[PDB]
Structures are given as structure tokens and as C-alpha cells.
Amino acid sequence: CTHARSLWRLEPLRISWSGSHLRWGQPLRIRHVTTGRYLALTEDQGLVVVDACKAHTKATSFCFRVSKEKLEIKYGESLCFVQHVASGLWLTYAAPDPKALRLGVLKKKAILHQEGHMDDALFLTRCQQEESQAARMIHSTAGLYNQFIKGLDSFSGKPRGSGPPAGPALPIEAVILSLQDLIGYFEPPSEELQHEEKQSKLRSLRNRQSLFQEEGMLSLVLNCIDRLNVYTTAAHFAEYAGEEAAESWKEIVNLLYELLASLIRGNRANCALFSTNLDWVVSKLDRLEASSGILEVLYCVLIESPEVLNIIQENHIKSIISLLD
Amino acid sequence: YFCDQELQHRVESLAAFAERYVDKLQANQRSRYALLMRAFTMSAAETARRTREFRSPPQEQINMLLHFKDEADEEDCPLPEDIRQDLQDFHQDLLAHCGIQKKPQSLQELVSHMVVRWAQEDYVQSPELVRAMFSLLHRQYDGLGELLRALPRAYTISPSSVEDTMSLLECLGQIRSLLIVQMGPQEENLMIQSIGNIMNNKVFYQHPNLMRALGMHETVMEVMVNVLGGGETKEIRFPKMVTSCCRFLCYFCRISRQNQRSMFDHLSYLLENSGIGLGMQGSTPLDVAAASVIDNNELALALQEQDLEKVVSYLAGCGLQSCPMLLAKGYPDIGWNPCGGERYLDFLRFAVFVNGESVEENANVVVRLLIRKPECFGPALRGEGGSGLLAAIEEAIRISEDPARDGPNRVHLGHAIMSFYAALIDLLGRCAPEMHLIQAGKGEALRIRAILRSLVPLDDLVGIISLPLQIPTLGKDGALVQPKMSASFVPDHKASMVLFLDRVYGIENQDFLLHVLDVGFLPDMRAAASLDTATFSTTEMALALNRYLCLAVLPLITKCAPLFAGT
Amino acid sequence: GVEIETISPGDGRTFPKKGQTCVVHYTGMLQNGKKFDSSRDRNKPFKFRIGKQEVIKGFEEGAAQMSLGQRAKLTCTPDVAYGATGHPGVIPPNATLIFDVELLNLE
Amino acid sequence: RSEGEKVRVGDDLILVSVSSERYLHLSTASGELQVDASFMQTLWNMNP
Amino acid sequence: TPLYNLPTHRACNMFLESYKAAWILTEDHSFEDRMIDDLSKAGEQEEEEEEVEEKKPDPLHQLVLHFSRTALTEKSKLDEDYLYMAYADIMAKSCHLEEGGEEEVEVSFEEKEMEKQRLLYQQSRLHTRGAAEMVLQMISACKGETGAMVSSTLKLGISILNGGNAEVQQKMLDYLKDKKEVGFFQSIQALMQTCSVLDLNAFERQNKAEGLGMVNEDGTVINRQNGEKVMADDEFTQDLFRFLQLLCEGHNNDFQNYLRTQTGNTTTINIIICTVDYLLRLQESISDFYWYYSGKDVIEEQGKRNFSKAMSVAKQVFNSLTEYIQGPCTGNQQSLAHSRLWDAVVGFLHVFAHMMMKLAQDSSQIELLKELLDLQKD
Amino acid sequence: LPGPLRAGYYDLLISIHLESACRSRRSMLSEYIVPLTPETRAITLFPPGRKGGNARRHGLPGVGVTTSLRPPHHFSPPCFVAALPEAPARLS
């Protein structure tokens, strides 16, 4: 429930009634906020989320009917039976699958069946503006970082050779601005604030950090760091990518490390996620680029995780001493 | 620190007056006893004093002696007025010391004026400073309350035991210092050594009250929590640590019933932490729970239905899935772990049978949960399969017979199956209602009895009673071929069988009495008479057969002796 | 292979027994010049009786080999003393030890 | 639903005997649907 | 069995135990009012801070702010704090002295008003310093976990709210509306769910244990006194409903409507409906107790104590409901009209009729019959 | 000496010389066990001054005779020339 995956934007088919109160039976598109896809139909399962290109009125048009009877909507304290406008199938829960029963969580697959059940009615509940904004930045940041990853992989393994490394250039300015904006967004509350205000802003920061971590932005940031740290130096990154690309490779690496430190700041779960990647941070400690950044990442992990301290080994300690010597 | 020293002085003075006043009151009570024995003329006063002062527990009579503080109760006590005034004067001294009753004259006034002065001087910002300052203020303003809280920890030790008391204190300090240390090999070994030294110390069993007052039963429970935090994830860590911690705690429960009460107070954690993979062998949280519940009736009544539900859930899990440790060992997959099933069945046995009697409420709750979850009964008693207890027993015998299916201290799956069925049937038999309840005809008693009667059939029970057992015979070359212990059928199975038989189907007719006599009883008599000779009398299985005889089937014969008339 | 060096002469007359206590005020010192055990600045006339192997055998042999009141330099081999990180942290692995030993009294 | 609440019409119910402490059950393992009070539940949605 | 033959150390231990039980515990020392007054004295800080409007807090105010900051600390659970228990008890009794009064001669109007004003001043000495905010923060921070911490917090809140006084009621309402947090009301709902009702299995088990009896290692205690499993935390649930009654006392419809629906908050919990649910469970448990004892000719003393305790708890719940609906609070009246209160009422009426008949037949149960009539009056 | 260095050296002395014994004694100070000794029977609530001023006169805190059983402090000499030797845990 707290996960951003549960958030669904409701875009009516008519732009005029976008802000007007929702009608029972009004055609409308349900959209996943985090992934940007649209709930729709297909010939291979009952209903799945598809791309905006495939989101046609023949597929995405859903309407909240009052009940199963053949032919306004209150935010909570009411019940709505979802039905696709054209097909007429109702949004019902699949019968309890034995494999899902063996699994800990039920996780019922949604299926469109015309013979709906008696628990197909929903309790629509609005999420807060903070969570909505967080989901929207998650979507945009995921898009930008995926574009960056695809570009890095495109020129990876092929030298520049006095020629364009790839057709689509990397969105370097967009990535740098997004990194700076995310660092400012995860900026910790100042100690000059009062006790209650500081703790409330700390709580908001913790839940935003948990949202991003459980969505997987931390893993994608780590993947971008891996892609950039494949190359040893800005000269090597100019040998493969463009020189204008390698102009700010140092800045992108430093901002990525600072963003990772901000994401893992003060979160027990986020620092425990790096129990497997202790070898990763320790091996990247000696890197000249963002040495302070990786040292700060290690410091945050060690101060906010006991498990990593349980699984520190002598080679890790020797590498930390190699940082001194 | 200065106020701690002041409180220590207070309790030490209280102990000094304790010594002096018990001396004076003991002399006075002895002289009172002599005078009462001399005075045979005062019949009513002699009877009252003998019943109250001299036929009461020591704590009760010392309460009666010290009850003169109330002004109205100035005549019930037999103490002299001088002794009353001495204790009263010490009470006034203690109040004056605690401050009950310009420039400060004592530590209390100094600390009070100091704290108020700083807090009025400035809005201090350090939270630790605020907490310490106000804790000092509260201790200074509640001097009587601080001593009231400290006196539970106060204890008076005989001067002859001081060396062992210091040794126990050093071992306690070692364990408390190792508490904050993360667990490791050397720390585990030092904890083993300290626990062993504490157990071998005579003060451990000499003074259970001092034992609880020091209260490192909670410390070794903290050791349990710390080690089991890592033990629950993946496999158990430091099984020797777990075994020694129950060694100490389980023996601590066996020491005294008050220790048993204090350990039963924390029963919920032990049952939640008890698992098959955790306690796959040795001294376990299930063992400390069994020690805290066994041989005690008030605690058995205080047993929680949620705890019973949890252990029934573990029994259901044992019935559902096979032992992962056994699968790792490589023995054939059974589909259920009989060792864990038998351990939880034994815990339920100790829960539902105490002091040689069957507790009605716990028996009813346990049989209710058992029939709510039919998978707890095992594959034999499952409704759909209908394998039959007797057929399953024969299957287990052939499983122990064939080496390939019986092979991968040593785990024997056939005997594990037999022991699981024996433990389940024993639990049902001791959950059966009392004969008094059956004769009274209570609806719940007859209902539970009928449920057990439907659960277990007569023919399977008489068959397993009549089940033939192999016999240790001397070989042709002179090698005594004895059955393998814990691998072959054991007489404890038949013991639980006949215990269920006489607790649910109490033999009332001579036809079925003589039927089971010719089925299983008389063959057992022939086997024991044959084993009587000293060539095979020393064998452990024959000794266990004799135990089975005298403890299970011989009392049934003594009970049914009047029914044997007219044969 | 403890190496005797006579820094300052002593009695040259009274030498330790197996079973005689020696109070020594030594200055443990590494090959590179880093002390590790200054019993003199700790004010410790360390009492040890010769021949009982409570002390590293190189230092004990050097103390028995020296006479009372004779200040001497003991160059103890890492084999003869602390072969593998004796008192880890104090002594590096495989390092020769220099001890500035004098016998306060031969008891 | 929870115990102590009035039973709704058409609501699934679990009829349990008080004598045998066994649930009314629809057994179909024999090939023919039969009624029998046994130790596993069956949702009898008795309706008026 | 004699005492002179006992070893000296064991006699000393028993003497310490008896002296603790019958002399130290029986002695009563009153330091709470004096210590609270000394803490509330500002001293000379206001004398040197006359020119500064934002004066430094007095020692009691600093104590309150420290407790509030430990409440506001973001923690998984509110851990036990013996310092807070002691201080909450001290403040609660300091404002509870005047509430308690510190054939029968009647009190004059002047005496009643003087007692009320001294009670108001003793409550001012805490709520002008943040006591109401403290109790709301710790009730929210307990996360609906029953314990001595929330028990002491509720006791302090009751002692502050005694008399249903408008200043502390308004301060609590303003703090709740300003913070717009659901923690307080969800903790109240969780505590309501974790409250207990009459348990007949526990009654039978307690009776069997009492008939059984036991012995002790030091001395001997036959029929050892143990915790009353029947009507556990009865004082705690009485304090909870008394705290709600004091919140809604004075017909303060703002707090009444806030308890009905939490406007501004993202989630609303209807404490009136929670009270209805708990009263329903209590009604069912008392009915089951009646069906148990109806076969019995005479109620035993254990059963009489259980009836008295459960019926006092019922009296507290009825008073809480009456303080909910007292005044023209149409929303509360409609909610209680349409949420199962009639069913609970029919159950209570059946119990009242049959207990009335039986306790009229039995002469020795006059006290229980009078308490029954009082509960029927409520 | 500078402030940070002075504090570091002070707490370093405390940690390497007094920390373990201090912690052990601090943990043991919670319980108050006392034997039957002539010292114990000589312990009095108030100092026996036998004077008007000495009446109801509290003595100095922490200066009286303590008979509560406290395990003695254990210390080992820090010598690194004796041959270093399961091995028991070292002392402070």
C-alpha cells in the first residue's frame, strides 16, 4: 500500500471533464503513475498495462459502474465495480491459485470476467501530494536514467575512432540537472530546526528514501555507476564516447555517488541492502574519481547498518587501511 | 554516585537491624514457646498460640510478630514492649535518614537546591543533562521509594558461604560483561565455563531467593535472545551455547517452584522461538518450556490457549512437511518429521498431565485444537487416506527392517514414526477425562471421551498390544544379538498404548479382558519369563520390557483383578 | 640467537641460576627504532626467575648470560622470541627485538 | 465476518456440531456428493 | 515450622520482607504537592527576564518539554521509562489532591466553589506548561499498546481533565487539530480493541487453582494470591473511558464532533462506535456469566467480585456514552441510534431482569442488587 | 595540552585501564547483598556521636564502612617480554 506501485492516475477520455467530478459509467483511462503504462486489454491475458502507443480507446477505456446491474463517485466510503466500456468484462479477482497459496502473499491476478464476483467493488483512496510528486519524479528519473544507460551501452565496447560513438547522444545535461535536483530533494533536514519540525521532516525524508529504494532507483543509480566506472579515466571515456561527453564525466560520477549517499542516508533497510555490495563499495574505495563520495557512502552504510559490520572481512579492513596509506 | 552510596548505607543498616532484631525476637519466641509448654492450665490461650504462632509458616508467624506497627493491633503480637519500642525507634531513625521527618545541611537538601538552582538559572539544552538532573531530584525527593525498590534486590547471606558468593558474583560479572560482546567462539567457550561454574557452585541451589534477586536467569535469557537472533536466520548458531543455556535455565526451573514461576512468566517467547531446525537435538527452548510447565498445577492452569494454539501449529507443520535436516542427511523423504512431532507431543503431554492427574481445561483445549487441525495426527489417522494406526506401525516395522529405506545419535525413521504415534496416543490418553468425571456423567467429559473413542479404534490398539517383538538371543558363535536401541520397536510404545487403553476403554468385561490377555499380555509374560535368566537379563531392551511390565500392564492387572473372578 | 652487547659493565661476578629471581628494568625496542615495552617508564622492576620459561627464551638466556648491574643490549631473534606476532599489535611479524637489560638485584 | 455478529442472508456459514465437534461437510471423494460431519470445513451458505 | 530453629540469614531475609510489606509500604509520605510547587516556582529568572517577553521556562516547564521531546522522538515503540512513570504519578497526584477533597456535613456553595478553584489552579500549574500536549503525544506514541506507560499517561490526563474544564479541553482540541495526526485516535481504537471482558474459562481456571492451593519455598503460602485473570486491566479500561468522558464533559460539542469524525485528518475513527463495540462485548460476556450462574442457587464470593468489577466497568462505559450524547449533539445521537446500541441494550435488559429476580430471591446479595440497580439507572 | 588531545588522552587512560573494571563494578552495584559479620553488626543507621548535635546528624555520604559483597577488581601487568601462551581471557 505504501509502495508507489499502488498509485493509479485516472485520466478521463474527455479532457473537458478532467477536473470535473467523476461520473459513474464515464469512459476513462487508468494509468500506472510509476511506470507510465496504461491499463488495457490484450488477446493473451485478460488485462495488462500497455504503452501509451498501444493505449487506444478500444483497450484502455474503463468505467466505474455502480453495480453489476445493466444501465458522483465518492472518494472513499463507497464502492465501485470496474468494467471495460466496450467489452463489458468486469474487473474481478482470480480464483486462489494453489501456487500463490503456497506463497506467503496471496497476490491475486486481476482478470476481466463478465461473470463478476461480489468483492469486485473498490475503495478508492487518494494518496498524498508528496507521494504523488515522488512517483512522478520516479517515473521521469527512471526514463532519463534508462536513456543514459542505453547510450552508455551503445558506445560501450566500440571505440570512438574519430567518429560519432552513437546516433542518439547522451542526455548529459538532463542527467546532471536530475542528479542535482534529487540531491536537493533528499537533502537532510537542518539541525537548526526545532525538535518536532526536525523529526517530522526526518520522517518525510525517511519515507521518501524508502519509496525510492523499494521502487529500485537505488539499484538503477548503482547500475549507472557501474556503467560509468567501467572506464578508468576521463581520457578513456573520451576514447570511447565523445570528448564533449567526457567533459563532465567526473561531475556525473561525483553526483551519482552523492545521490547514492543521500538515498542510503539514515535508512536501516537501505544500508542493509548493501550487505551484498560491501565488496562493491570497498573495491571502488580506491578510485580517484569521487573518492570522498565513495568514502561517505561507506561511512553511511557502516554507521546505519550492523549487518555489514558483521560481514566485514580482513580484505575489506586492509582496503580501508590502504585508503590511509 | 554519592546517593547510591547513601542508599547502600541505608540497606546495610537495615540488614544490621535485621540481624539484631531476629536475634532478639528468636530468643523471645523461644522463651514464649517454653512458657506455653509449661502453662498447661490456659487451654484456650495455649491452643490459639499453638495454632497461630507455632503451627504457621515462618513468614506468616514473622508477619504476625511484626504486625504491631498499626496502633489497633497492639495486642495480637506477643512481643515485649521493649522490643516493640526498639523496632519503632529504628523506624523513626530510618525515616529521619530518608528525610521524612537556608543553607543545605545534608546531601538531599544540597541536591534539591542544586537542581532547582540550575533549572531556574537557565533553560538547559542537553537532554541527558535534563534526564540526569531530574532523576537526581526524584531520588532525593523519594528516599523511601528508592529503598522500597532496592529492598527486593537486598539479600542477607550467611558468613560461611561468602567465598562461593563472591565466586558466583565474579561469574555473573563475566556473563554480564560478555553480554555486550558479539557472540563468537571464545565468548561461547567462556560462557560455557561460567555457566558450568555457576551450576557447580553450591549457592545456586542453596538460595533460590538470592538466585532470583541477582536475577541472571533474565541474563541467560538475554543470551538466548542474542544467539537466537542469528540462529533463526539460516541454521542455528552455537548449538553448544543453546544446550548450556537450557542446562542452566532448565536446572534452575528444577531447583524451585518460584524459579519455575519466574521462568513460566516468559513462556510465550520460548514457544515462539522453538523450532525443529533450531532444536533439532539437545537442550532447547521447548525443553525449558517443558521444565517450566511440568510437575506444576497452578502453572498448568495458567497455561495460555494462545500458547497451546502455537504448539498445535508447530505440530501441524511437523505433520505437513518432512525434516529438512533429515533430507540433508539423505534419509528417505517421509513427508513429515516424526522427531519434531514427538517433541511437541511430549511438550503437550507435560502440559496436559501434571501431578499424576489429567487437567480438564488444558485437556479439552488441546483435543479441541487437535481435531480442528487434523494434519497434526499424522498420515496414519488422516481421514482421506485411512492408512490405519496398526498398518502404519507394521509399515514402520518393515521400514526399520529393510536397511535401504532405513539408511541415508543416528536417526532411525521407522522408530521415529513409531515414537510419534506412541506420543500422540499417549497425549490423547492423558487428555482423556478422569474416571470421576466419567462416573459423574458430565457432558463435556463424555463428549471428549467419545471424540477420543472415534479418533482411535479398538482393533488397532489391541493389534499393537499383540504386536510381536524381537528378542535378544545368543548367537550360534556366542555373540548376543540384541535389537538395536532406538532403531527397533521399543516397549514404551506398548506402554503408551495400554495407558490410552485403560484411560479411555477402562476394562469392564472379562471377554475383552481375556482377549487382550491372550493377545498381548500373556505373550509379554512369556517373553519376560524367558528373558529372566542372567544370560539375557542384563540387556537394556529386556530391562525396558521389565519397566514396561511393572509401570504399565501390571497395574492394569491389579485394577482388573476383581474382574478376573469366575474364570 | 640472542646477541649480547655490553653497554655498561657491571659486577662480572654474580650470574643468575636456574631458579634465581631477577628484577630487570628493560627497554624493549624494535630493529627500526620503535620501542614496544618500556618497563622503566612504567616503573616495573619486572621479576622473573631464570629457567622456568615464563619469559621468551632469548631474553631469559640473555639475562642469565649477563651479570648483576651490567647494562647490556640483547638482540633476540624472532625465532627465539615472538615468532609470529607475539602480543599482536605490540610486535610486528618476524622482527628482531632489542632489549636494554640491567639486573637491579639478583634474588 | 466475525463472531457475535448477526448472520446476513446468503452469507456463507460453517455449521459445527456441538456433540461431535465436527463440521458439516460435502464429501465428493467417493464419486457421489454426500453429507457427513467430519473434521474439515465446508461453507454451507444456508439461505431462508 | 518453628522460627528459632531457622537459620539466622533466612530469618533476616523474612524480616526484611515483612518490614518492607508492613512498615515501609504502609508508611505514607506526601512530597508530590511540595515538590511540584518547588518545581513550578520560577525563582529569579523572571526577575532578571522582565525585559524579555520570551522568558526561559521554569523547571516544571523544562521537565514537560523534555517529556514532550521524548514523546516526539520517532521511535518504533514507546519504551518504558521509570522516570516518566514517577514524574507522571507525582504531577497527577499533585493536581488530584484538590479533586479528592484535599450524617456527613454538607458543603456550602462557597466551599464547593473554593474547592473547584483550587482544583483549577492545581491543573493550571501543569496545563499552562504543556501537560495536555504531553499526554496527547504519549497516547499517540504508545501505538495502541496496553501497558503501565499508557496507564500512567491516562492517569495524568484524567487528573488534568478532572471537572471537564474548558481550558485543557480547548488546548487538547487545538493541539489535535493543529497537528492533524491520526496516531492519537488510532491508539485509542487499538486500546479499545485490546481491552478485556469477562472470561468464564478464566473464572473456572481461577476457581480450580484456588481450590487446589500450593506451597512456597521460603515459608509456605497456601492458596497463593495470583493475578486476577478475570477482569484484568479493569482499572485501565475504567481510566480509558473516564478519560474519554472527561474529554467530552461539559457538553463541548467541538470535541464531541471531533471524536465522532476527525475532520482534516486523512482517516477518521469513530470512538463512539468503538465504545459501542466494547459495550457489546461486555454485554455478551455478562450475559454468558448469567447463563453460567443461573443454574447455581447462590453466587459465590468470587462471582460476586467479578460481577462488581465488570458492572463498575459497565457503569463507566454508560457514563462515557451519556457524556457523548449529553447536549443537542444530533450527530452523536444519530450514530448511537443507528449503531447496534439497541441490541446491546436488549442484552443488558435481559441480564438486568434475570439478575434482579435472582438477587431479590437471595437475601445476602443486597450489595450486588444495589449495584445492579445503579447500573440500570445509568 | 590542547583540549581535544587532553580529552582523548584522559578517556584513553580510562578506556585501557579502568573501563572493564568500572563496568563490572557498575553492573554489580545494582544488587545489595550483605553477610553476617562483626562489621555488619557494627553498621549503624546514624553515626554514634552520642551528642545533641550528632542527634539526627547525617554522616558524610560514601565515607562509611561498606560490607556489601563486591567482587574484587582484577588487573594484570602489561608486560610484553614474558612469553605469551584454551588461553583464558586477559585482564585489564
Curated annotation (Swiss-Prot), chain C:
Pfam families the UniProt entry points to: FKBP_C
Domain PPIase FKBP-type residue range list: 19-107
Main location: cytoplasm
UniProt xrefs under InterPro entries: FKBP-type_PPIase, PPIase_dom_sf, PPIase_FKBP_dom
Name listed for the protein in its UniProt record: Peptidyl-prolyl cis-trans isomerase FKBP1B
Endoplasmic reticulum listed as a keyword: no
Gene behind this protein: FKBP1B
CC per GO annotation: intracellular membrane-bounded organelle; sarcoplasmic reticulum membrane; terminal cisterna
Enzyme Commission number(s) of this protein: 5.2.1.8
GO biological process, one term: regulation of cardiac muscle contraction by regulation of the release of sequestered calcium ion
Subcellular location: Cytoplasm; Sarcoplasmic reticulum
Stated role: Has the potential to contribute to the immunosuppressive and toxic effects of FK506 and rapamycin. PPIases accelerate the folding of proteins. It catalyzes the cis-trans isomerization of proline imidic peptide bonds in oligopeptides.
Enzymatic reactions: [protein]-peptidylproline (omega=180) = [protein]-peptidylproline (omega=0)
GO molecular function: peptidyl-prolyl cis-trans isomerase activity
SUPFAM superfamilies in alphabetical order: FKBP-like
From Swiss-Prot, chain D:
Location in the cell: Sarcoplasmic reticulum membrane
Post-translational modification: The N-terminus is blocked.
Expression tissues: Detected in skeletal muscle (at protein level). Fast- or slow-twitch skeletal muscle.
Outcome of swapping residue 8 to C: Decreases threshold for channel activation by K(+), caffeine and 4-chloro-m-cresol. Decreases inhibition by Mg(2+)
Residue stretches in coiled coil: none
Domain MIR: from-to ranges: 4-48
Organism superkingdom: Eukaryota
UniProt similarity note: Belongs to the ryanodine receptor (TC 1.A.3.1) family. RYR1 subfamily.
Subunit and partners: Homotetramer. Can also form heterotetramers with RYR2. Identified in a complex composed of RYR1, PDE4D, PKA, FKBP1A and protein phosphatase 1 (PP1). Repeated very high-level exercise decreases interaction with PDE4D and protein phosphatase 1 (PP1). Interacts with CALM; CALM with bound calcium inhibits the RYR1 channel activity. Interacts with S100A1. Interacts with FKBP1A; this stabilizes the closed conformation of the channel. Interacts with CACNA1S; interaction with CACNA1S is important for activation of the RYR1 channel. Interacts with CACNB1.
Function summary: Cytosolic calcium-activated calcium channel that mediates the release of Ca(2+) from the sarcoplasmic reticulum into the cytosol and thereby plays a key role in triggering muscle contraction following depolarization of T-tubules. Repeated very high-level exercise increases the open probability of the channel and leads to Ca(2+) leaking into the cytoplasm. Can also mediate the release of Ca(2+) from intracellular stores in neurons, and may thereby promote prolonged Ca(2+) signaling in the brain. Required for normal embryonic development of muscle fibers and skeletal muscle.
Other comments on record: Binding of [3H]ryanodine indicates that the heterozygous channel is activated by Ca(2+) concentrations 4-fold lower than normal. Single-cell analysis of cotransfected cells shows a significantly increased resting cytoplasmic Ca(2+) level and a significantly reduced luminal Ca(2+) level.
Comment block on domains: The calcium release channel activity resides in the C-terminal region while the remaining part of the protein constitutes the 'foot' structure spanning the junctional gap between the sarcoplasmic reticulum (SR) and the T-tubule. Pore opening is mediated via the cytoplasmic calcium-binding domains that mediate a small rotation of the channel-forming transmembrane regions that then leads to channel opening.
Protein name: Ryanodine receptor 1
Source organism: Oryctolagus cuniculus
